[PDB]
Amino acid sequence: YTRVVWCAVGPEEQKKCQQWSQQSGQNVTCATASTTDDCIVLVLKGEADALNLDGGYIYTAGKCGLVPVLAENRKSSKHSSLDCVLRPTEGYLAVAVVKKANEGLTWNSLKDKKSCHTAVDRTAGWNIPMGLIVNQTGSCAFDEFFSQSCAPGADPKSRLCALCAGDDQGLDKCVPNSKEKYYGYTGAFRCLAEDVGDVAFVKNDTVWENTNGESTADWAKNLKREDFRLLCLDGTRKPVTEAQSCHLAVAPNHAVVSRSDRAAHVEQVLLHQQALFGKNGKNCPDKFCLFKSETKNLLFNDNTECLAKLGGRPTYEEYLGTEYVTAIANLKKCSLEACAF
């Protein structure tokens, strides 16, 4: 009832969820699945209540009747007065990032190069860049465009997984969960940083959070912002400070979804959970911080300031916006009134 079952994707999120569970006095409990799609199915069956999803998955979930409940909100600049929970979301910038040293690589010479994607079906890592590439190429053979990639969630024996590395034992290659070394925003940026790929499709924030000492992780220690460039759609390369004028799209923020019949209850529990474990929460950083996990973005993104209420009781189509929704519909004609399960 006032007990919510959260769905965790893979073993590291499970571990974080368990801690949250313990600290919440079991107001929150945990179910675990190997992929986000499987978590969506748990939610449909009523065996889990909720999870926080990237926009590409909100589209999947939406067709099956799930609804957005609250949205990640990061630090803003305009609307200084408003409380975080009431502040409108701004959205993130999807970018394509390369090494400065890889000169003469631009948007127009990406063909046959190596790519790093957060996961198949995700906004910045897949839907935006592959949608543009299909568009520009006039062809649904997006699996042939790059020579090799790491795109968690594709066929492990395909060239889309050739660059994925699996877990510290080499198992679970290309699975779309954090066990895969190059999964997610951080994984795809690591894939570029280690020069496994030529380009990473991530968001603007990922570059800043993993360079110039912001990350203490071994692979990101010595990374410098100046060693990276953004690829712009006009064929130019720009410094990472110019993301405002050099992105592939603005993406809708990740948001918590649930079955509509459970939305109201998930919302109230979460609002109270963040008062306890959120940014300035009563027990964070004392006992547990919901929005921390050492740059690994477990359950929620680490840069989340709060979960915010949605202005308008959005359907998922309204939450995603008509320009994003049509982009996805078009790309999925290669790979409408449905539910995949």
Ligand X SMILES: OCC1O[C@H](O[C@@H]2OC(CO)[C@@H](O)[C@H](O)[C@H]2O)[C@H](O)[C@@H](O)[C@@H]1O
Ligand Y SMILES: *[C@@H]1O[C@H](CO)[C@@H](O[C@@H]2O[C@H](CO)[C@@H](O[C@@H]3O[C@H](CO)[C@@H](O)[C@H](O)[C@@H]3O)[C@H](O)[C@H]2NC(C)=O)[C@H](O)[C@H]1NC(C)=O
Ligand Z SMILES: *[C@@H]1O[C@H](CO)[C@@H](O[C@@H]2O[C@H](CO)[C@@H](O[C@H]3O[C@H](CO)[C@@H](O[C@@H]4O[C@H](CO)[C@@H](O)[C@H](O)[C@@H]4O)[C@H](O)[C@@H]3O)[C@H](O)[C@H]2NC(C)=O)[C@H](O)[C@H]1NC(C)=O
Q: Which residues are annotated as a binding site for hydrogencarbonate?
A: 118, 122, 124-125
Q: CA 254, CA 308: separation in Å to the nearest integer?
A: 11
For ligand NAG, the binding residues (CB under 6 A) are 2, 24-25, 27, 276
Among the listed residues 306, 276, 279, the one whose alpha carbon sits nearest the alpha carbon of residue 23: 276
Do the Cβ atoms of 332 and 212 come closer than 8 Å? Answer: no
Q: Judge residue 218's burial from the number of C-beta atoms within 10 Å of its C-beta, 0-12 exposed, 13-18 middle, 19 or more buried.
A: exposed
Indicate whether 89 belongs to the interface with ligand X (CB under 6 A).
Answer: yes
Partner interacting with residue 330 (select from ligand X, ligand Y, Fe ion, none; CB below 5-8 Å by kind): ligand Y
Range in contact with ligand Z (rule: CB under 6 A) among 13-21, 201-209, 225-233, 329-337? 201-209
Regarding 302 and contact with Fe ion (CB under 5 A), the answer is no
Tell me which residues in 242-271 interact with ligand Z (CB under 6 A). Answer: 243-244
Nearer to Fe ion by Cβ, of 54 and 198: the residue is 54
Q: Whose Cβ is closer to ligand NAG: residue 204's or residue 274's?
A: 274
Residue closer to ligand Z by CB (options 205, 267) is: 205
| Alpha-carbon distance values, 185 to 81, 96, 133, 273, 297 (Å) | 31, 12, 20, 25, 8
Alpha-carbon distance 312 to 282, whole Å? 30
Beta strands in 104-155, from DSSP E residues, in sequence order: 114-117, 148-150
- Residue 216 as a binder of ligand Z (CB under 6 A): the answer is no
Measure Cα distances from 222 to 98, 120, 211, 226 in Å.
16, 29, 7, 12
Residues 249-268 interacting with ligand X (rule: CB under 6 A): 250, 252-253
CB contact set of 265 (below 8 Å; sequence gap of 6+): 1, 2, 4, 49
Question: Smaller CB distance to ligand Y: residue 67 or 110?
Answer: 110
Residue ranges of the annotated binding site are 54, 92, 118, 122, 124-125, 185, 254
Closest contact distance (angstroms) between CB of 223 and ligand Z is: 13
Give the type of residue at 123. Answer: T
Binding residues for Fe(3+), as ranges, are 54, 92, 185, 254
By CB under 6 A, is residue 214 in contact with ligand Z? yes
- Judged by CB, which is closer to Fe ion: 50, or 105? 50
Q: Nearest CA to 8 among 303, 338, 296, 314?
A: 296
Q: Is 5 helix (H, G, I), strand (E, B) or coil?
A: strand
Using rule CB under 5 A, residue 172 touches Fe ion: no
Q: Which is nearer to ligand X, 91 or 166 (CB)?
A: 91
Which of ligand Y, Fe ion, ligand Z, none interacts with 135 (beta carbon under 5 to 8 A by kind)?
ligand Y
Stretch that binds ligand X, among 108-116, 120-128, 283-291, 315-323 (CB under 6 A): 315-323
Residues near Fe ion (CB under 5 A) are: 54, 123
